[PDB]
Amino acid sequence: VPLDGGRFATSDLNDLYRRVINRNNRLKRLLDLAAPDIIVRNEKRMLQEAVDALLDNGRRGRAITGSNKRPLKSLADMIKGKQGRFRQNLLGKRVDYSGRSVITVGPYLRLHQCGLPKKMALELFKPFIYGKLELRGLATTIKAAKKMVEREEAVVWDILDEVIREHPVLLNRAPTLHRLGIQAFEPVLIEGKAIQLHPLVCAAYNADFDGDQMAVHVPLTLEAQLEARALMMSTNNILSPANGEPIIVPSQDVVLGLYYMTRDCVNAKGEGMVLTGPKEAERLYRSGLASLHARVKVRITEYEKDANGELVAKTSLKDTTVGRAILWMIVPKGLPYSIVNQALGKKAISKMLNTCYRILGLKPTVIFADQIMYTGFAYAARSGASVGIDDMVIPEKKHEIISEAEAEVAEIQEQFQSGLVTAGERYNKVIDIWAAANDRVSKAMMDNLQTETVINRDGQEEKQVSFNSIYMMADSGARGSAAQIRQLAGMRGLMAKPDGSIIETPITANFREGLNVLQYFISTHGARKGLADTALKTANSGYLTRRLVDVAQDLVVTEDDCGTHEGIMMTPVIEGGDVKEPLRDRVLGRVTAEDVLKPGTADILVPRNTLLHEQWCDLLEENSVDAVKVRSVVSCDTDFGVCAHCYGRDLAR
Amino acid sequence: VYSYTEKKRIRKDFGKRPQVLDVPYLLSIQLDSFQKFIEQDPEGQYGLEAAFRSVFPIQSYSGNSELQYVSYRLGEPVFDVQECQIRGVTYSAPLRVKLRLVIYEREAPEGTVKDIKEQEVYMGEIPLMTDNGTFVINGTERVIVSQLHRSPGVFFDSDKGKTHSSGKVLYNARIIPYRGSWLDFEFDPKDNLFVRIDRRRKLPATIILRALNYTTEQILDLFFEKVIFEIRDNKLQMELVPERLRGETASFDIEANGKVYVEKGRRITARHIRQLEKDDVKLIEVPVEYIAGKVVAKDYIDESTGELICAANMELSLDLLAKLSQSGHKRIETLFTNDLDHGPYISETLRVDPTNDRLSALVEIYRMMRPGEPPTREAAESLFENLFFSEDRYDLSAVGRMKFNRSLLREEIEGSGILSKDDIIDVMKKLIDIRNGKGEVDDIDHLGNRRIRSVGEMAENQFRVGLVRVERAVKERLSLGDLDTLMPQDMINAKPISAAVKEFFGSSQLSQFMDQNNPLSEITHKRRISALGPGGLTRERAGFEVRDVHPTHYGRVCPIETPEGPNIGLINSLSVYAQTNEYGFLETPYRKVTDGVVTDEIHYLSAIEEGNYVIAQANSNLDEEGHFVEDLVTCRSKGESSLFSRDQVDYMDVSTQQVVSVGASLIPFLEHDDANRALMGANMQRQAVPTLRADKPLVGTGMERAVAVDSGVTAVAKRGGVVQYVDASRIVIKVNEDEMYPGEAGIDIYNLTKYTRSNQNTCINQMPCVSLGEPVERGDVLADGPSTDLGELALGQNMRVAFMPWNGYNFEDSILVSERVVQEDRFTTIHIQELACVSRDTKLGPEEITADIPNVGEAALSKLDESGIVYIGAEVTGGDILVGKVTPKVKDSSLRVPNGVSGTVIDVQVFTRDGVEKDKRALEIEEMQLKQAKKDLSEELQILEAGLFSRIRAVLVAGGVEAEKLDKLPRDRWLELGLTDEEKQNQLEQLAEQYDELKHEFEKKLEAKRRKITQGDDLAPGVLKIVKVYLAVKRRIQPGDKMAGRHGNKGVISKINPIEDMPYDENGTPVDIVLNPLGVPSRMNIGQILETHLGMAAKGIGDKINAMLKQQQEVAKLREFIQRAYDLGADVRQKVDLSTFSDEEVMRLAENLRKGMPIATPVFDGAKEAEIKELLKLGDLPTSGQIRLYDGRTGEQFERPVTVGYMYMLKLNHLVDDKMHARSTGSYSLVTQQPLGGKAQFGGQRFGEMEVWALEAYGAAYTLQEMLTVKSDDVNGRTKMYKNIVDGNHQMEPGMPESFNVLLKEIRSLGINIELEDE
RNA sequence: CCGGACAAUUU
DNA sequence: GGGTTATGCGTTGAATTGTCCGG
DNA sequence: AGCAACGCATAACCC
Ligand SMILES: [Mg+2]
Ligand SMILES: [Zn+2]
């Protein structure tokens, strides 16, 4: 490769070959006039060093330098290592027809579609635009097609729309971790230079919007396109391939809107009346003659799948609210009503979505999830929660508690200085009393935030759940946990020191009143420890997962049944405390070897070549089986692979 | 009492702790480092003089010549900063050193004959540092970062963790000099002492101790203790010491004076020890086995036959006992062994040692340092004496000797600079004592054991290395000289020194690239500390102790403004009040505290001194005269803090802002945010971008004025006076009569740099801030640079904030903006992209710059001229030709503007090398530079001569004044008037000769400028001319950019919201910025709501004042309102008196504060909730600050009130059009048939192994095969697929991987046979 | 073309 | 009388990318 | 011309 000017930049291999050829020529010329033994031995030694430097530098002795201070590379050092061919060009390689930009949100699309810039879509689909133009006849040749694409008058936009309506793309993230990393969506021509992905898949990607870069790839062959529509679709990979929890998880804004919806109160505007249906309920809520959450007996009408596929309609009355009825209007067909009568928390809505999926199916389930997202965002926009400095309340007993804490600390210090106890027990007493005071402050502030605000009941007083912003945000499972709200409101307790121990002088104040420089420096180092070790932790995790995926790859299901009666004896794993993994989640979907009999007196339950599912799990739970002899992948005896009978149900299906 | 220029905008400040020490110059570290680097200080003393006085005295082998040195001077640089950076030359000054060479005659000790004295010889051109602390290498601007490394001396580690799975703790010593070989005193689990040179292999220590001119008996008597034996008729007595037996347990019988004290199996305790000291009987009875277990030291022969009885360092036995009993000896010196007092490590080492003589020891040393070489005795002796007792290859420093003496517990801190036998003995004794149990070790993460470097010390070390490298050739040429007929400049050499200093100042791991896109970033990078350069640690060979901050990081290293990525914890910063110690430590100021009165006198304490005394906390309640109101106060003693009393304290912190840095100091309410959140906030404030209007902040810390003054981005007036002519290009300051010097008193001219480009493609502009006819003081702000306003660093802007979810547009942490922001044009930043043009002279002639280019277009040539260069001020877009270039074949090779940056050409510079005929365009361009230079010089001469005539007429006015001879005769004849020949006449004559020399300097400078413009500059050997064009792209807010704040919260704009859709209050004012309340529990920023409330109070006060000023009210009401607003609060230090102001000053103050009220908030003592509520109650705002709003779509009152307010935000240097990239089909690589990568070059993505594994986990095979074989590897398959797509057919075909082909070809070129077989 | 340096992300 | 254990040297340490500029 | 951790590789035990 040349450089700036007529001079050409030398290469490592070129220099090594030049040195070897020069040494060979010198040896051949010197072995003509009968050169002495010392000179020919020195020449042979130099030629040996030259050929060693050409083959493999750094292994034998020192590494010869081809520059000022950088060690020269050889064929062995270029092939092996991190920058080798196997890791730089064979497996990992650069591809075309791809883009990258900053993502946004755009909460106005369905699930099997995402956002993508208009100019980027025109640039990525240039061959498709050329083909469509040449098949329509509006272009003369490739030069005319290039001129039309670079001019952009009016036909190119509709041609791009035509090719976008029926061409899914595959977005891509750089740090992929699990299987769900490259999905399939449908672009929409949106002005701008950013990507508008669905907010529900962000929690699945463990992604955010802090200027992150996302890549996109577009298939261009019919088999890969069909494979994408069958497997890579977000409306197909709902169930997670690890456990049984699906991937469509309601986001924090959605769960906050639903929690504000189904939050019943003791008195509101229009409490103590009856109405016909949720239709009139939402009408009255929009008119303003009735509150959003008010106890009103509304007649409901649902269906049930008690028959063999046929649904039975029924009509009854239930004492509920208005928001609950409005949320019930978007329910699909066959679901009970006792699922929208509680507070509808994060685990509650997760269980409800899982139950709706497993009872009805897939397409109405994803439609219901999209509708839930829409209605949650809409009601969040309608209400809007706001955190206030007055909404955050400091307990009035925190001063007295910390005063008693300092008094006990001073008493222990004086008793230790007087010559009674040792520094070890003094430090133990200090840490335990400080932990006790921190836990007391935390529980006090939790009780305050959970029942601070009260309302009337058309005549007297009544205590209920507090209508505080932080309390709602902590109870709906949106953002923040118990320790999180503790750190936000009250004392953070003690925190460890870099060596491994913990500081005997904890934090006195919280974040609202005022910390000192000393406590700030303590928290600084306590957080910097983690902020420094997380990088090496991620590096070690990446190395471990690479080693695992490299050591366990050659295994393809080649047969259906091997015809063996071996496996692992399933026993309930118990570690000191209680049952960790339940038997249902343990043998959920796995064909057993022999005929598993009922634990009764010689009663056959399930056969030996059948798939186990939820019904069989319920039967096993009713029969109370201790251990179930099921097959195992390591117990399977299949030549070059593992049969499908020694695995059971496929995950994510 | 305050200043007069500060009356334009006084910032209200809160707080309760009165400050005592002001803020010094933040570039003081670089200034003192450079002054220590270059200085004419005599007697050496760590500098160029010291290096010269240390290395120059060098004699000759046989030349009979000695070259000395007297002093050295410096010359004036050929180019100054401005035009130096404009061209691209290294801003350096010629260094001249005067030397003398003497020559003596043979057969005489020092009989000289004739000596030559070289007058100012050259030895290298070293670059000078400007006032801003920046260096110039090749027209750029780089700052050398200080280095934190290990102090030269002796250290004692433990290396616990890898103890061969034994659990035994080890203690090793590490003697590290300043420049020489190392010395490690390692240990073994088998109780043995070993040494090593340059960390090669394990070697015994007794061999070195003997080679240090010492025998076995002397070594043993010097290290171990003597146990004298005596021989009588019976009961062989032994001299034992209780201090010796305090470790081991004497299991034998002990009796004295006929009384048995210790029997068999009684353990000796403290009472036994005191009884032994009281008896002092060193003549007891010992068993025969203990004598055999003892080790004799010296040799012993027979008393009759004279035969050697026992050898040196060997166990005794019954035969030797009988031999000593039959002899007549009375004194036998023996060693002493113990397990918890003194181990016989030297005894086992000497036993393992096969040698026993110094000659064999030296032979073994020579054989181990260079095998395959005859070990000569003289050569080995010279090698052993040249490693530890030399003055060239081994030398320490003053700080090294001080640390060595401090670790060895000596008395003097000075002395010699090399290692000595006594020092080796002392270090070995200390290591033995540490291994025995007594004495602790020293760690590495402590600040009292490390040492910081500087630019001056590092440059001195590099210069010394180059000089000691060239001294070899100097001495060789001096020895192989002549007979008193040479030349000093011909015998001296300086090319290695020049190359060394050039590579050190250019290519260095510490001398990195500066980022001048922000004054805060500049002032942080000027004090950044990095322990990454040579002499310290790397990036992958680090653990946890070097990453986590040691508790001694108090007021010196800031733990906040630190980066995050590959290297976390290594890159640090420096505190505000932290200074550099005289030895190279890290100093911090501390107020001297008496027994009960806190004196304002400060006292500096180092790292080794802070751990001895107790210092109280900064934020502590105290009286006005410095008296502790409370009894208990939190203090510290050795890093670990605790709680002490009142009469037990010694010192106290100076201020509360010393524990934090200066870049992180611009975060209001740092105590309200978490550590990591404040860290990322300080980082994102460092990487910022100036907006269009530098709007004043409303919740500033208070040090913004000091930061803007200390920075070099503004024009500070040197000597104050009266301003007469204000302009946006030059400022003229007429000084008052107070500051009038009898020689060159003069006017003050300050130039203003216009729109130029910074390092990160950012624009920097200086705007004036003074009025016509206004007095000024010394040290006054006159211009405002980037992100500055009236001397205050104003980075971001001020917006209306509110906190409510809105249709999910703010998902997890997204930011919502309104259309009013983009309508008023207030975040439209200016970016200047650097485009480089190159015109070479290759085959078939050079590349001409003419407009006669075939196959062109009139629409494209209309923007160009008849040369091929666009005019100044034309708006170009993506796809236009800027500078026209053609290559003879003729092929067009002009410079094209990249796609995506619609900028504007504002300046075109052509640098033609001397010797090329210029065309008419270059001629007219040169004429334009000459014209503007002549105009500038003429106007400068005009203003200077106007000042000279004003001065001389003011001198003639004082004394004899004659109006007739002043108005009748012309102005040119003002030399012979009625005036007494005194000091006034002296001033007139000196001003006359000053005007004469100014016109002479004007003529000389005009000639020099003409010569420099006519001549050519220096370029690369192969290029003719170069064109540097600066663009001007107007970047507005576009959906995808990156908004954030001063608390760590991040934001990405999703979609703009109209004014009609944004919510509005009861008055009708919509909100502009809406965040997400869900980001508060995640990222701990409790200070965000406090800043919001403060912004409401400040905006309300400013709007109230503006309304009162607009409705036309008298000055009394405005004065009362301002007085109340400035005196509200509990107890603040800002005490103003409005009764001593004028009506115009109040009118101007109200007019300036009509658009907001700046409120100060120093870091750990800002405003409180009580003051915030009081200000809100004074203003027309509610107490809670949570007002009820109206919906923008429908329009109704919300269920609960929402939080709205004002927040100071800013824009990051990340843009959507700069972070976006896309490619469908382009060029590929050459070595491997794969597409390229990057944005500047038309490249794509990279389908890596992790996503390949993801596709493997998926049930997809054809897609991955298409991605890995068709898109990049198979060129034929890619072309066929592209043809089928453009033809209207959908078929894919596999192919051979070119990467696999390359791999197999390489493995075939190697020594491995692989092939492809066929079935 | 290979490294050096800074920096985003893995919070 | 062969074989048990300190010593010397071999391998490696996630992912993709906007920047600077040097030989 | 300063890893860190762990394994394989010569050349001495001590019966
Ligand atoms: Mg992000
Ligand atoms: Zn099987």
The domain that holds B925 is classified in CATH as: 6.10.140.1670
Structure token pair of residue B1003: 């003529």
Does any domain span residue B16? no
Q: Are residues B1115 and B997 in the same domain?
A: no
Chain B hits for A103, Cβ within 8 Å: 1052
Q: Are residues B245 and B327 in the same domain?
A: yes
* Nearest listed ligand to the Cα of residue A564: 2
Structure token pair of residue B286: 């010992």
Give the CA dihedral B158, B164, B167, B173, nearest 10 degrees.
Answer: -20
Which residue's CA is nearest to the C1' of nucleotide C2?
A11
Return left, alpha or beta for A9; rule: phi > 0 is left, psi -120 to 50 is alpha, else beta. Answer: beta
CATH number, domain containing residue B866: 2.40.50.150
Chain B hits for A480, Cβ within 8 Å: 1081-1082
* CA of B11, C1' of C11: distance in angstroms: 36
* Nearest listed ligand to the Cα of residue A634: 2
Kindly determine whether residue B672 and residue A511, on different chains, have CB atoms separated by under 8 Å.
Answer: yes
Using CB atoms within 10 A of its CB, is residue A600 exposed (0-12), middle (13-18) or buried (19+)?
exposed
* CA of B1305, C1' of E6: distance in angstroms: 35
**Closest CB to A213 among B1219, B1256, B1257:** B1219
Q: Are residues B802 and B681 in the same domain?
A: yes
Return left, alpha or beta for B1002; rule: phi > 0 is left, psi -120 to 50 is alpha, else beta. Answer: alpha
Q: Are residues B923 and B1025 in the same domain?
A: no
H or E stretch at A579: none
Strands A116-117 and A189-190: parallel
Kindly determine whether residue A102 and residue B1311, on different chains, have CB atoms separated by under 8 Å.
Answer: no
Does any domain span residue B437? yes
Gap positions in chain A, given as the residue before each gap (C–N > 2.5 A)?
none
Kindly determine whether residue A505 and residue B641, on different chains, have CB atoms separated by under 8 Å.
Answer: yes
Q: Are A585 and A552 in contact (CB under 8 A)?
A: no
Nearest in space to B455 (alpha carbons), one of B508, B414, B406: B508
The count of domains in chain B is 9
CA–CA dist B108, B122 (Å, integer): 33
Kindly determine whether residue A192 and residue B1040, on different chains, have CB atoms separated by under 8 Å.
Answer: yes
Does any domain span residue B1? no
Q: What is the DSSP-derived secondary structure letter of residue A640?
A: T
User: What number of CA atoms fall less than 13 Å from residue A132's CA on the CB side?
Assistant: 18
Measure B652 CA to nearest chain A CA, in Å. 13
Structure token pair of residue B668: 């209001």
CA–CA dist A522, A508 (Å, integer): 12
Coil, helix or strand for A386? coil
Residue of A nearest to B1278 (CA): A96
* CA of A67, C1' of D23: distance in angstroms: 9
* CA of A44, C1' of D7: distance in angstroms: 33
Whether A475 has a binding-site annotation, put simply, is no
Coil, helix or strand for A483? helix
CA–CA dist B52, B39 (Å, integer): 13
A83 Cβ nearer than 7 Å to chain C strand: yes
Does any domain span residue B816? yes
Who contacts B97 (Cβ-Cβ below 8 Å, separation ≥6)? B52, B69, B71, B72, B73, B120, B121, B123
Q: Are residues B908 and B805 in the same domain?
A: no
CATH number, domain containing residue B734: 2.40.50.100
Nearest in space to A492 (alpha carbons), one of A442, A430, A528: A442
Does any domain span residue B720? yes
**Closest CB to B1081 among A99, A473, A533:** A473
Kindly determine whether residue B548 and residue A532, on different chains, have CB atoms separated by under 8 Å.
Answer: yes
Q: Are A183 and A234 in contact (CB under 8 A)?
A: yes
Give the CA dihedral B140, B144, B145, B147, nearest 10 degrees.
Answer: 150
Does any domain span residue B13? no
Indicate the residue among B1016, B1050, B1069 that finishes a domain.
B1016
Does any domain span residue B780? yes
* CA of B677, C1' of D15: distance in angstroms: 25
Strands B259-262 and B816-817: unpaired
Kindly determine whether residue A182 and residue B1254, on different chains, have CB atoms separated by under 8 Å.
Answer: yes
CA–CA dist B442, B498 (Å, integer): 40
Q: Residue written as tokens 């918890």? A: B340
> In Å, how far from its chain's centre is CA B105?
54
**Closest CB to B1247 among A95, A117, A413:** A95
Using CB atoms within 10 A of its CB, is residue A339 exposed (0-12), middle (13-18) or buried (19+)?
middle
Kindly determine whether residue A516 and residue B1203, on different chains, have CB atoms separated by under 8 Å.
Answer: no
**Closest CB to A123 among B811, B1224, B1297:** B1224
Q: Are residues B1282 and B1295 in the same domain?
A: yes
The DSSP bridge partners found for residue B185 are B173
Q: Are residues B1175 and B1273 in the same domain?
A: no
Chain A hits for B1309, Cβ within 8 Å: 75
Q: Are B1103 and B1095 in contact (CB under 8 A)?
A: no
Whether A37 has a binding-site annotation, put simply, is no
Nearest in space to B951 (alpha carbons), one of B978, B974, B982: B974
Q: Is A428 on the interface with B (CB under 8 A)?
A: no
Q: Are residues B1175 and B1080 in the same domain?
A: yes
Q: Is A470 on the interface with B (CB under 8 A)?
A: yes
Nearest in space to B253 (alpha carbons), one of B294, B295, B290: B290
- Phi then psi dihedrals of residue B606, to 5 deg: -85, -175
CA–CA dist B404, A527 (Å, integer): 36
Q: Is B806 on the interface with A (CB under 8 A)?
A: yes
Whether A202 has a binding-site annotation, put simply, is no
CATH number, domain containing residue B819: 2.40.270.10
Q: Are residues B352 and B480 in the same domain?
A: no
Q: Are residues B701 and B769 in the same domain?
A: no
Q: Is A227 on the interface with B (CB under 8 A)?
A: yes
Which residue's CA is nearest to the C1' of nucleotide D23?
A9
- Chain D positions within 7 A of any protein Cβ atom are 6-8, 10-23
Query: What is the edge-to-edge ordering of all strands in the sheet holding B797-803?
Result: B816-817, B1073-1075, B797-803, B1203-1211, B1042-1045, B1050-1052
User: What number of CA atoms fall less than 13 Å from residue B592's CA on the CB side?
Assistant: 7
Q: Is B1239 on the interface with A (CB under 8 A)?
A: no
**Closest CB to A211 among B547, B807, B1052:** B1052
Whether A562 has a binding-site annotation, put simply, is yes
CA–CA dist B199, B174 (Å, integer): 11
3-state secondary structure A252-308: HHHHHHHHHHCCCCCCCCCCCCEECCHHHHHHHHHHCCCCCCCCEEEEEEEEECCCC
Range of the domain at B805: 656-712+788-827+1036-1219
Coil, helix or strand for B190? coil
CA–CA dist B98, B112 (Å, integer): 20
Q: Are residues B1297 and B1238 in the same domain?
A: yes
Whether A643 has a binding-site annotation, put simply, is yes
Q: Are B689 and B1211 in contact (CB under 8 A)?
A: yes
Does the domain at A397-530 match CATH 1.10.132.30? Answer given as yes
Measure B204 CA to nearest chain A CA, in Å. 26
Residues with C-beta atoms within 5 A of ion ligand 2: A 562, 636, 643, 646
Report residues 141-180 of A contacting strand C, contact meaning Cβ closer than 7 Å: 175
Q: Is B409 on the interface with A (CB under 8 A)?
A: no
Q: Say how many Å lie between the first and final Cα of chain B, rounded.
A: 101
Which residue's CA is nearest to the C1' of nucleotide D11?
A81
Return left, alpha or beta for A273; rule: phi > 0 is left, psi -120 to 50 is alpha, else beta. Answer: beta
Q: Which of residues 108-127 of A touch B (CB under 8 A)?
A: 117, 120, 123-127
Give the sign of the dihedral formed by CA B189, CA B191, CA B192, CA B194. positive
Kindly determine whether residue B1186 and residue A386, on different chains, have CB atoms separated by under 8 Å.
Answer: yes
Q: Is A370 on the interface with B (CB under 8 A)?
A: no
Using CB atoms within 10 A of its CB, is residue B448 exposed (0-12), middle (13-18) or buried (19+)?
buried
Resolution of the deposited coordinates, in angstroms? 3.9
B543 Cβ nearer than 7 Å to chain E strand: yes
Report residues 153-182 of B contacting strand E, contact meaning Cβ closer than 7 Å: 161-162
The Cα-based distances of B106 to B63, B103, B111, B475, B1093 in angstroms read 10, 10, 8, 19, 92
Q: Is A210 on the interface with B (CB under 8 A)?
A: yes
H or E stretch at B358: helix B358-369
Does any domain span residue B15? no
Q: Is A514 on the interface with B (CB under 8 A)?
A: yes
B387 Cβ nearer than 7 Å to chain E strand: no
Q: Are B633 and B620 in contact (CB under 8 A)?
A: yes
Q: Are residues B935 and B1031 in the same domain?
A: no
Measure A203 CA to nearest chain B CA, in Å. 10
